[PDB]
Amino acid sequence: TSFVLMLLFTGIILIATNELTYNRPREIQYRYLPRDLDSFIRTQEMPSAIFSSMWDVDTRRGG
Amino acid sequence: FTSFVLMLLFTGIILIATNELTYNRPREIQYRYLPRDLDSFIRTQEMPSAIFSSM
Amino acid sequence: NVGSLELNNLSTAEDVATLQNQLNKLAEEKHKRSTWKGLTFRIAVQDMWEALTGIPTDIYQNSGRVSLKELLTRDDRLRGLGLIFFLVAVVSIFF
Amino acid sequence: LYQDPVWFQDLSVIFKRPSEIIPTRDQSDSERINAMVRLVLYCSFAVALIRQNYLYAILGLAIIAIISLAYALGAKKTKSNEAYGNIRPYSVKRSKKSCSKSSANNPFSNATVGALLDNEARPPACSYDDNDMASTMRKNFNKGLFRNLDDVYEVENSQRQFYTMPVTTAAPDLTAFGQFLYGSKGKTCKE
Amino acid sequence: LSQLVAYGAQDVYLTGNPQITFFKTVYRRYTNFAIESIQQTINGS
């Protein structure tokens, strides 16, 4: 009985040690990859909208 | 005599079941796409400045 | 502005795949978290599967010429020795 | 290049293959720990057999764990067991000679400029066959390189040109070379 | 040149792509180097 009591005591001590060392945190870092070629082309702005201002009104005169 | 080692294993195996959680320790890092404009800028640039990096 | 290169993802991946890199590594993170959560204190019934994996494979580990103690016991086997709790409960019921 | 016989530490199952060694002599530290393990296991098992209480074996295993854990954790990293020149005074007991293992930046450990980077004193890149560094060398060479899958004895991507230079330290170690050609002969006739 | 490549936050979050006016050239900042020319020794008549 006494052996059981001491064994439970030390087992509870080591279990408490495990629980206290269990809560150590972990960290995530973000790694950024470049866009794939097809996705890039699908995302690319049409020239009709990139530089449409070339015929907007003019530069020597206002609107 | 026998009951002594039986109880010893009885508590020890619960202790082992508590212990085992510590073994697996993987690293977590996520992946995300570049911003479109930044991606275009990086793809367009001709010189790399620093040569290489391993992480 | 700078080029940083990741060599591998626990398995060398040549700089050819583009989205396979994201899919593979997301699967890696999912597997790691699944193993962590099914390998922590919170288990429902998986102890039986862990014990049944432990005994034959623990014995077979010595059927190889060697097997490192870091692998004979820590390869998802430590709680696999949790069946000794079951057997000592059984004999304590008897004895 | 300097070579030593084989040993291993108490992990795996070596503690049974060269069995019946109990106490240390002219053995490596890993071998000495193994011998202490053999002592404790046989002593505790014999004591348990003599007095059938089934707990002396448990205490023997516990003290085995204590000794192994102490050896694993308390090792001092301050080792400079590098052999070159005329004198190796640091230790005369069995130990693993230092090797500069192959690395990603220097696949062949040729000590081109890595010596001036951090090591200053760089241990020699030991033999091609010592510690399976042939596989590591091949893996490091075949990092980021594509093969045409017409050569399974790969020579097509020019393995042959690349090799380890005869000397891999800052100095050629001329003293060892001279002792090789011209033995000391100890006490000679003129003495 | 064949290894997978990705950027950290320091090259994404703390930066971005500036808009450049055709007529405002922004020159690249570069490494420090110098060029010399020397003669080599010829072995053979």
Coordinates of C-alpha atoms in Angstrom, one line a residue:
Chain A
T1 CA 0.0 0.0 0.0
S2 CA 2.8 2.4 0.9
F3 CA 4.7 1.5 -2.2
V4 CA 1.5 2.2 -4.2
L5 CA 1.2 5.6 -2.5
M6 CA 4.9 6.6 -3.2
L7 CA 4.7 5.3 -6.8
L8 CA 1.5 7.3 -7.4
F9 CA 3.2 10.3 -5.9
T10 CA 6.2 10.1 -8.2
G11 CA 4.0 9.3 -11.2
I12 CA 1.9 12.3 -10.5
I13 CA 5.0 14.4 -10.2
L14 CA 6.3 13.3 -13.6
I15 CA 2.9 13.7 -15.2
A16 CA 2.7 17.2 -13.9
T17 CA 6.2 17.8 -15.4
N18 CA 4.9 16.5 -18.7
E19 CA 1.9 18.8 -18.6
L20 CA 4.0 21.8 -17.8
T21 CA 6.5 21.0 -20.5
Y22 CA 3.7 20.3 -23.0
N23 CA 2.5 23.9 -23.4
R24 CA 5.6 25.2 -25.1
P25 CA 4.4 27.2 -28.2
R26 CA 5.2 26.9 -31.9
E27 CA 5.8 29.7 -34.4
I28 CA 4.8 29.9 -38.1
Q29 CA 6.7 32.0 -40.7
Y30 CA 5.2 32.9 -44.1
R31 CA 7.1 32.0 -47.2
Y32 CA 6.0 33.9 -50.4
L33 CA 6.2 32.2 -53.8
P34 CA 6.1 34.0 -57.1
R35 CA 3.0 33.5 -59.2
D36 CA 2.9 30.7 -61.7
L37 CA 3.1 31.6 -65.4
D38 CA -0.5 30.8 -66.4
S39 CA -1.9 32.4 -63.3
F40 CA 0.2 35.5 -64.0
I41 CA -1.0 35.8 -67.5
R42 CA -4.6 35.3 -66.3
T43 CA -4.1 38.1 -63.8
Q44 CA -2.2 40.4 -66.2
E45 CA -3.9 43.7 -66.9
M46 CA -5.0 44.2 -70.5
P47 CA -3.2 47.0 -72.3
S48 CA -6.5 48.6 -73.0
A49 CA -6.6 49.5 -69.3
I50 CA -2.9 49.9 -68.4
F51 CA -2.2 52.9 -70.7
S52 CA -5.6 53.9 -72.1
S53 CA -4.8 57.5 -71.1
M54 CA -2.5 57.9 -74.1
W55 CA -5.6 59.1 -76.0
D56 CA -7.6 60.4 -73.0
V57 CA -7.6 64.1 -74.0
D58 CA -4.2 65.6 -74.5
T59 CA -1.2 67.0 -72.6
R60 CA -0.8 70.5 -74.1
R61 CA -4.5 71.4 -73.5
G62 CA -7.0 70.7 -70.7
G63 CA -10.5 69.2 -70.9
Chain B
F1 CA 6.0 -9.7 -4.6
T2 CA 4.2 -10.1 -7.9
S3 CA 1.6 -7.5 -7.1
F4 CA 4.4 -5.0 -6.4
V5 CA 5.8 -5.2 -10.0
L6 CA 2.2 -5.3 -11.3
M7 CA 1.4 -2.0 -9.6
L8 CA 4.8 -0.6 -10.7
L9 CA 3.9 -1.3 -14.3
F10 CA 0.3 -0.1 -13.6
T11 CA 1.6 3.4 -12.7
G12 CA 4.5 3.4 -15.1
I13 CA 2.5 2.7 -18.2
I14 CA 0.2 5.6 -17.4
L15 CA 3.3 7.7 -17.0
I16 CA 4.5 6.5 -20.4
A17 CA 1.2 7.4 -22.0
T18 CA 1.7 10.8 -20.5
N19 CA 5.3 11.0 -21.7
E20 CA 4.6 10.0 -25.3
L21 CA 3.0 13.3 -26.4
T22 CA 6.4 15.0 -26.5
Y23 CA 8.0 13.0 -29.3
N24 CA 6.5 14.6 -32.5
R25 CA 7.9 18.1 -33.0
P26 CA 7.3 19.3 -36.6
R27 CA 7.9 22.8 -37.9
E28 CA 5.0 24.8 -39.3
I29 CA 5.5 27.4 -42.1
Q30 CA 2.8 28.4 -44.6
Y31 CA 3.0 29.5 -48.3
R32 CA 1.3 32.5 -49.9
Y33 CA 1.4 34.0 -53.4
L34 CA 3.1 37.3 -54.1
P35 CA 1.2 40.5 -54.7
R36 CA 0.6 40.8 -58.5
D37 CA 2.5 44.1 -58.8
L38 CA 5.4 42.9 -56.6
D39 CA 5.5 39.6 -58.6
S40 CA 5.8 41.5 -61.9
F41 CA 8.5 43.7 -60.4
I42 CA 10.5 40.8 -59.2
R43 CA 10.1 38.9 -62.5
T44 CA 11.1 42.0 -64.5
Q45 CA 14.3 42.8 -62.5
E46 CA 17.5 41.7 -64.1
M47 CA 20.1 41.6 -61.3
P48 CA 19.7 39.6 -58.1
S49 CA 22.0 41.6 -55.8
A50 CA 22.7 39.0 -53.2
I51 CA 23.6 35.7 -54.8
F52 CA 21.7 33.0 -53.0
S53 CA 20.0 32.1 -49.7
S54 CA 19.1 28.7 -48.3
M55 CA 16.1 29.7 -46.2
Chain C
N1 CA 13.9 42.1 -53.7
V2 CA 16.0 39.1 -52.7
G3 CA 16.1 35.5 -53.7
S4 CA 15.8 33.0 -50.9
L5 CA 15.7 29.3 -51.8
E6 CA 14.2 26.4 -49.9
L7 CA 16.2 23.3 -50.7
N8 CA 13.6 20.6 -49.8
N9 CA 10.3 19.8 -48.1
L10 CA 11.7 16.7 -46.2
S11 CA 12.0 15.3 -49.7
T12 CA 14.1 17.0 -52.4
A13 CA 11.8 18.8 -54.8
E14 CA 13.5 20.2 -57.9
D15 CA 12.6 23.7 -59.0
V16 CA 10.1 22.5 -61.6
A17 CA 6.8 22.1 -59.8
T18 CA 4.9 25.3 -59.0
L19 CA 1.7 24.5 -57.3
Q20 CA 2.6 20.9 -56.4
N21 CA 5.0 22.6 -53.9
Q22 CA 2.0 24.2 -52.1
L23 CA -0.2 21.1 -52.3
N24 CA 2.5 18.8 -51.0
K25 CA 3.5 21.1 -48.1
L26 CA -0.1 21.7 -47.1
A27 CA -0.6 18.0 -47.0
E28 CA 2.6 17.8 -44.9
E29 CA 1.2 20.4 -42.4
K30 CA -2.1 18.5 -42.3
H31 CA -0.4 15.2 -41.6
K32 CA 1.9 16.7 -38.9
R33 CA -1.1 18.2 -37.1
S34 CA -3.1 15.1 -37.5
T35 CA -0.3 13.0 -36.0
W36 CA 0.2 15.6 -33.2
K37 CA -3.5 15.6 -32.2
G38 CA -3.9 11.8 -32.5
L39 CA -0.6 11.4 -30.6
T40 CA -1.3 13.7 -27.6
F41 CA -3.1 12.8 -24.4
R42 CA -6.5 13.1 -26.0
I43 CA -7.3 9.7 -27.5
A44 CA -10.6 8.0 -27.7
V45 CA -10.2 4.4 -28.8
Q46 CA -7.0 4.5 -30.9
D47 CA -5.1 2.8 -28.0
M48 CA -6.0 -0.6 -29.4
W49 CA -4.6 0.2 -32.9
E50 CA -1.5 1.6 -31.3
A51 CA -1.0 -1.5 -29.2
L52 CA -1.6 -3.8 -32.1
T53 CA 1.0 -1.8 -34.1
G54 CA 3.4 -1.8 -31.2
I55 CA 3.8 -5.5 -30.3
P56 CA 4.5 -7.2 -33.7
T57 CA 6.6 -4.2 -35.0
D58 CA 8.5 -3.8 -31.7
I59 CA 9.4 -7.5 -31.9
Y60 CA 10.3 -7.2 -35.6
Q61 CA 12.5 -4.2 -34.9
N62 CA 15.0 -6.6 -33.3
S63 CA 14.5 -9.0 -36.2
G64 CA 16.6 -6.5 -38.1
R65 CA 20.3 -6.6 -37.4
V66 CA 20.0 -3.5 -35.2
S67 CA 17.4 -0.9 -34.4
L68 CA 18.2 2.4 -32.6
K69 CA 16.4 2.9 -29.3
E70 CA 15.4 6.3 -30.6
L71 CA 13.4 4.3 -33.2
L72 CA 12.6 1.1 -31.4
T73 CA 10.4 3.0 -29.0
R74 CA 9.8 6.6 -30.3
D75 CA 8.4 5.6 -33.7
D76 CA 4.8 6.1 -32.6
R77 CA 5.4 3.1 -30.3
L78 CA 5.8 4.6 -26.8
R79 CA 2.1 4.7 -26.0
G80 CA 1.9 1.5 -28.0
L81 CA 3.3 0.0 -24.8
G82 CA 0.1 1.2 -23.2
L83 CA -1.3 -2.3 -23.4
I84 CA 0.8 -3.1 -20.4
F85 CA -1.7 -0.9 -18.5
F86 CA -4.5 -3.2 -19.8
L87 CA -2.7 -6.4 -18.8
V88 CA -1.7 -5.1 -15.3
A89 CA -5.4 -4.1 -14.8
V90 CA -6.4 -7.6 -15.8
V91 CA -4.0 -9.3 -13.5
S92 CA -4.8 -6.9 -10.6
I93 CA -8.4 -7.9 -11.1
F94 CA -7.2 -11.5 -10.9
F95 CA -4.5 -11.0 -8.2
Chain D
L1 CA 44.4 9.9 -43.7
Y2 CA 44.1 8.2 -40.4
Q3 CA 41.9 5.2 -39.7
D4 CA 40.6 3.6 -36.5
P5 CA 38.7 0.4 -35.8
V6 CA 34.9 0.2 -35.5
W7 CA 32.8 0.7 -32.4
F8 CA 29.3 1.9 -31.4
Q9 CA 27.4 3.3 -28.4
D10 CA 24.8 1.4 -26.3
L11 CA 21.9 2.3 -28.6
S12 CA 20.6 -0.2 -31.1
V13 CA 21.3 -3.8 -30.0
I14 CA 25.1 -3.8 -29.9
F15 CA 25.1 -4.6 -26.2
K16 CA 24.6 -8.3 -27.1
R17 CA 26.8 -8.9 -30.2
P18 CA 30.2 -8.4 -28.6
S19 CA 28.8 -9.6 -25.3
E20 CA 30.8 -10.6 -22.1
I21 CA 32.7 -7.4 -21.8
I22 CA 32.1 -5.9 -18.2
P23 CA 34.7 -3.2 -17.3
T24 CA 36.7 -0.7 -19.4
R25 CA 40.2 -0.8 -20.8
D26 CA 41.8 0.7 -23.9
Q27 CA 38.3 1.3 -25.3
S28 CA 36.4 4.3 -26.7
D29 CA 34.1 6.3 -24.4
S30 CA 31.1 4.8 -26.1
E31 CA 32.6 1.3 -25.6
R32 CA 33.3 2.1 -22.0
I33 CA 29.7 3.1 -21.5
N34 CA 28.6 -0.1 -23.2
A35 CA 30.8 -2.1 -20.8
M36 CA 29.3 -0.3 -17.8
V37 CA 25.8 -1.2 -19.3
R38 CA 26.9 -4.9 -19.5
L39 CA 28.1 -4.8 -15.9
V40 CA 24.9 -3.3 -14.6
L41 CA 22.6 -5.5 -16.6
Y42 CA 24.3 -8.8 -15.6
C43 CA 24.7 -7.7 -12.0
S44 CA 21.1 -6.7 -11.6
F45 CA 19.7 -9.7 -13.5
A46 CA 21.8 -12.1 -11.4
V47 CA 20.7 -10.3 -8.2
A48 CA 17.1 -10.6 -9.3
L49 CA 17.5 -14.3 -10.0
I50 CA 19.1 -14.9 -6.6
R51 CA 16.4 -13.0 -4.7
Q52 CA 13.2 -13.4 -6.7
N53 CA 11.5 -10.1 -6.0
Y54 CA 11.3 -8.9 -9.6
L55 CA 12.4 -5.4 -8.6
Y56 CA 16.2 -5.5 -8.7
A57 CA 15.9 -5.8 -12.5
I58 CA 13.8 -2.7 -12.5
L59 CA 16.4 -0.8 -10.4
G60 CA 19.1 -2.1 -12.8
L61 CA 17.2 -0.8 -15.8
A62 CA 16.7 2.5 -14.0
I63 CA 20.4 3.0 -13.3
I64 CA 21.1 1.9 -16.9
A65 CA 18.9 4.8 -17.9
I66 CA 20.7 7.1 -15.5
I67 CA 24.1 6.3 -16.8
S68 CA 23.1 6.4 -20.5
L69 CA 21.3 9.7 -20.0
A70 CA 24.3 11.2 -18.1
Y71 CA 26.6 10.2 -21.0
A72 CA 24.2 11.5 -23.6
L73 CA 23.6 14.9 -22.0
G74 CA 26.9 15.7 -20.2
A75 CA 29.2 15.3 -23.1
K76 CA 31.6 18.3 -23.5
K77 CA 31.8 19.7 -27.0
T78 CA 35.3 21.1 -26.4
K79 CA 37.0 18.4 -28.4
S80 CA 39.8 19.2 -30.9
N81 CA 41.0 15.7 -31.5
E82 CA 42.7 16.5 -34.8
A83 CA 45.7 14.5 -35.9
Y84 CA 48.4 16.1 -38.0
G85 CA 52.1 16.8 -37.9
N86 CA 54.4 15.2 -35.4
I87 CA 52.4 15.4 -32.1
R88 CA 48.9 14.2 -31.1
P89 CA 49.1 15.1 -27.3
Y90 CA 45.4 15.8 -26.6
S91 CA 44.6 12.1 -26.0
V92 CA 46.2 8.7 -26.4
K93 CA 43.0 6.7 -25.8
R94 CA 40.6 5.3 -28.4
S95 CA 38.5 8.0 -30.0
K96 CA 37.0 8.9 -33.4
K97 CA 39.2 11.1 -35.5
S98 CA 37.7 14.4 -36.5
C99 CA 36.4 14.6 -40.1
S100 CA 35.3 17.6 -42.1
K101 CA 32.1 16.2 -43.5
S102 CA 30.9 17.2 -47.0
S103 CA 28.6 20.2 -47.0
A104 CA 26.1 21.8 -49.4
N105 CA 28.4 24.8 -50.1
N106 CA 31.5 22.5 -50.4
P107 CA 30.4 19.1 -51.8
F108 CA 33.9 17.7 -51.9
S109 CA 35.4 19.4 -48.8
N110 CA 38.3 20.7 -51.0
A111 CA 39.0 23.6 -48.6
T112 CA 39.1 26.2 -51.4
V113 CA 38.2 29.2 -49.2
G114 CA 36.1 27.5 -46.6
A115 CA 39.2 27.3 -44.4
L116 CA 39.5 31.1 -44.3
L117 CA 35.8 31.5 -43.6
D118 CA 35.2 30.1 -40.1
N119 CA 37.3 27.1 -39.3
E120 CA 40.8 28.6 -39.5
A121 CA 42.1 25.1 -38.5
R122 CA 40.1 22.7 -40.7
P123 CA 40.2 18.9 -40.0
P124 CA 41.1 16.8 -43.0
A125 CA 38.4 15.5 -45.2
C126 CA 38.8 11.8 -44.4
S127 CA 38.7 8.8 -46.7
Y128 CA 36.1 8.3 -49.5
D129 CA 34.9 5.1 -47.8
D130 CA 35.1 5.9 -44.0
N131 CA 31.6 6.9 -42.9
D132 CA 29.4 6.5 -46.0
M133 CA 30.3 10.0 -47.1
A134 CA 30.3 8.7 -50.7
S135 CA 26.5 8.6 -50.7
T136 CA 26.4 12.1 -49.1
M137 CA 28.9 13.4 -51.7
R138 CA 26.8 12.0 -54.6
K139 CA 23.6 13.4 -53.1
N140 CA 25.2 16.8 -52.7
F141 CA 26.6 16.8 -56.3
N142 CA 23.2 15.8 -57.6
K143 CA 21.5 18.8 -56.0
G144 CA 19.6 20.8 -58.6
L145 CA 21.2 18.9 -61.5
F146 CA 19.1 17.1 -64.1
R147 CA 20.2 13.8 -65.7
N148 CA 19.2 12.6 -69.2
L149 CA 18.3 9.1 -67.9
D150 CA 20.7 7.5 -70.3
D151 CA 23.4 6.8 -67.8
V152 CA 22.8 4.7 -64.7
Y153 CA 26.5 4.7 -63.9
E154 CA 26.4 8.4 -64.1
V155 CA 29.4 9.8 -65.8
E156 CA 27.5 11.9 -68.3
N157 CA 27.3 14.9 -66.0
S158 CA 31.1 14.9 -65.4
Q159 CA 31.6 13.2 -62.0
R160 CA 35.2 12.3 -62.9
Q161 CA 36.5 15.8 -63.2
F162 CA 35.4 16.6 -59.7
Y163 CA 37.3 14.9 -56.8
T164 CA 38.8 15.5 -53.4
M165 CA 42.3 17.2 -53.5
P166 CA 45.1 15.2 -51.8
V167 CA 45.3 17.8 -49.0
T168 CA 42.2 19.3 -47.4
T169 CA 43.8 21.4 -44.7
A170 CA 45.4 24.8 -44.7
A171 CA 48.9 23.2 -44.7
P172 CA 50.2 20.1 -46.6
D173 CA 51.3 18.6 -43.3
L174 CA 54.9 18.2 -44.6
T175 CA 56.1 16.6 -41.3
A176 CA 53.8 13.5 -41.8
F177 CA 55.0 13.3 -45.4
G178 CA 58.6 13.3 -44.3
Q179 CA 58.0 10.8 -41.6
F180 CA 56.4 8.6 -44.3
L181 CA 59.4 8.8 -46.6
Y182 CA 62.0 8.9 -43.8
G183 CA 61.2 6.9 -40.7
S184 CA 62.5 8.1 -37.3
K185 CA 64.0 4.6 -36.7
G186 CA 63.9 5.5 -33.0
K187 CA 67.4 5.0 -31.4
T188 CA 69.8 4.6 -34.3
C189 CA 73.3 3.2 -34.5
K190 CA 74.9 6.7 -34.3
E191 CA 73.2 7.3 -30.9
Chain E
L1 CA 19.4 27.7 -60.4
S2 CA 16.9 24.8 -60.2
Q3 CA 15.9 25.1 -56.5
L4 CA 12.4 26.3 -55.6
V5 CA 12.3 30.0 -54.7
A6 CA 10.2 32.0 -52.2
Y7 CA 10.4 35.4 -50.6
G8 CA 10.1 36.3 -46.9
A9 CA 7.9 39.1 -45.5
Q10 CA 10.9 41.5 -45.4
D11 CA 10.9 41.5 -49.2
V12 CA 7.1 41.8 -49.5
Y13 CA 5.5 43.4 -46.5
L14 CA 8.2 46.0 -45.8
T15 CA 8.4 46.9 -49.5
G16 CA 6.3 47.0 -52.7
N17 CA 6.4 48.1 -56.3
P18 CA 6.8 51.9 -56.8
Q19 CA 5.2 53.4 -59.9
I20 CA 7.9 54.9 -62.2
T21 CA 7.4 57.9 -64.5
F22 CA 8.9 57.3 -67.9
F23 CA 10.9 60.5 -67.5
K24 CA 12.2 59.8 -64.0
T25 CA 14.9 57.2 -64.3
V26 CA 15.7 55.5 -61.0
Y27 CA 19.2 54.0 -61.4
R28 CA 20.1 50.8 -59.7
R29 CA 22.4 50.8 -56.6
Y30 CA 25.1 48.2 -57.2
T31 CA 28.0 46.3 -55.8
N32 CA 31.5 47.7 -55.6
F33 CA 34.0 46.4 -58.2
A34 CA 37.0 47.4 -60.3
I35 CA 38.4 46.2 -63.6
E36 CA 42.2 45.5 -64.4
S37 CA 44.0 44.2 -67.4
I38 CA 47.3 42.2 -67.0
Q39 CA 49.4 40.0 -69.2
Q40 CA 49.5 36.2 -68.9
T41 CA 52.7 34.1 -69.4
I42 CA 52.8 32.0 -72.5
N43 CA 54.2 28.6 -72.2
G44 CA 55.5 27.4 -75.6
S45 CA 57.5 29.1 -78.4

